[PDB]
Design a protein around this ligand. Structure first.
Ligand SMILES: *[C@](O)(CCl)[C@@H](N)Cc1ccccc1
Length: 293
C-alpha cells in the first residue's frame, strides 16, 4: 500500500521549487506530473498517487510562482520557462533516465511544449484535458457558454463584459460552469480546493490565465503550437472528458499531429478526470506506462 512521499524544497535552475516524490515498491517506471492553471499546484493531482502500488513513481511539484514555490521575475511567466524548469528538475534528480511525462490542463499544454524540445528524455507522454492552441480552446469554451441556460449564459456575457466579476450572479454562473465542465461533483476534494486556493493567492493564474477558466485575458491568449506537436514521435496517451471545459475536439487536434497516439474520452466526465474516475483514470495511465516500458 502507500508508503508516504519524500518532500523537499530544492534549488532548480535559479529558483526554489517544491517537490514531492513517491517511489517503489517494485519500481518499474518514473513519472513526472505538471499541474494546470497556470498558477495552481500539484495538490489536485494527488489522486495519481495511487499508481505507486502499480509500480509507478510519481513526481508532484509546484511550478514557478505556484503553490509552495517562489515566484520568479514577471518576465519568466512563459511556457518556455516551465520547460527549462522541468528538464532541470528531471536531470538534477533522476540524472539521465527516461521518464514518463504527465500534464494536466495547462500542464498538458506545457507537457507538449516539453516533448517538442526534450522528447528524447521521455519514454512516454500523457496529455489530459490539455491543449496545443489557446485560441482554439477559447473558441470551444464560448460554445459551452452559449449552451448554458440563459440564467447564467447572459450573466457571463454581461458582468463578464463590464469587468464585474465580483458580482454574485456572475460568480453564480462561474460556479455552474465549474460544476459542469471543470469537475462534476458536489463534494469537491480538498486537494482541488487547495490548488484553487493557491490560484487566487499567487499571481501566475492572474497574469497568465485571467479572471477565471472561461475568461482568459492573460499572456497565453494567443499561444498556439499545433504546427509543432506533429514532431512528437513517442507514445502518447491523450485523455479528455465528455463535458471537459477543454473539449475532446481540442483533444482531437493533438491526436492528429502525434502519430500512433491514443485518444480516450471519459463519458460522464469533465476536466479533472482524476477524481471523477480515479480508479479508471489511473488504470488507463498505468497500463499505458507499463506497455511502453
Ligand atoms: C487548466 O490548466 C485547468 Cl487545471 C486550464 N486552466 C487550462 C486553460 C483552459 C482554457 C484556456 C486557457 C487555459
Amino acid at each position: 500500500m502507500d508508503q508516504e512521499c519524500i518532500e523537499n524544497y530544492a534549488k532548480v535552475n535559479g529558483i526554489y521549487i517544491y517537490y514531492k516524490l513517491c517511489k517503489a515498491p517494485e519500481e518499474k517506471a518514473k513519472l513526472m506530473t505538471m499541474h494546470g492553471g497556470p498558477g495552481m499546484s500539484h495538490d489536485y493531482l494527488l489522486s495519481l498517487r495511487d499508481m505507486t502500488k502499480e509500480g509507478i513513481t510519481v513526481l508532484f511539484y509546484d511550478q514557478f510562482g505556484c503553490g509552495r514555490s517562489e515566484e520568479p521575475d514577471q518576465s519568466k511567466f512563459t511556457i518556455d520557462y516551465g520547460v527549462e524548469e522541468a528538464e532541470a528538475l528531471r536531470s538534477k534528480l533522476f540524472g539521465n533516465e527516461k521518464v514518463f511525462l504527465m500534464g494536466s490542463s495547462y500542464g498538458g499544454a506545457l507537457a507538449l511544449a516539453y516533448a517538442v524540445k526534450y522528447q528524447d528524455h521521455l519514454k512516454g507522454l500523457i496529455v489530459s484535458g490539455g491543449l496545443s492552441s489557446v485560441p482554439l480552446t477559447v473558441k470551444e469554451m464560448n460554445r459551452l457558454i452559449d449552451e448554458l441556460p440563459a440564467k447564467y449564459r447572459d450573466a457571463i456575457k454581461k458582468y463578464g463584459s463590464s469587468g464585474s466579476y465580483e458580482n454574485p450572479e456572475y460568480q453564480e454562473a462561474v460556479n455552474y460552469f465549474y460544476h459542469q465542465h471543470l469537475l462534476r461533483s458536489e463534494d469537491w476534494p480538498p486537494e482541488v480546493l487547495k490548488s484553487l486556493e493557491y490560484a487566487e493567492r499567487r499571481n501566475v493564474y492572474r497574469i497568465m490565465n485571467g479572471p477565471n477558466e472561461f475568461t482568459i485575458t492573460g499572456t497565453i491568449k494567443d499561444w498556439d503550437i499545433t504546427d509543432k506537436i506533429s514532431a512528437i514521435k513517442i507514445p502518447t496517451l491523450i485523455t479528455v472528458g465528455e463535458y471537459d471545459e477543454v473539449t475532446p475536439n481540442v483533444a482531437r487536434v493533438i491526436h492528429e499531429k502525434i502519430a500512433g497516439s491514443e485518444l480516450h474520452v471519459f463519458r460522464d466526465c469533465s476536466h479533472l478526470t482524476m477524481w471523477e474516475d480515479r480508479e479508471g483514470y489511473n488504470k488507463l495511465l498505468s497500463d499505458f506506462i507499463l506497455k511502453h516500458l
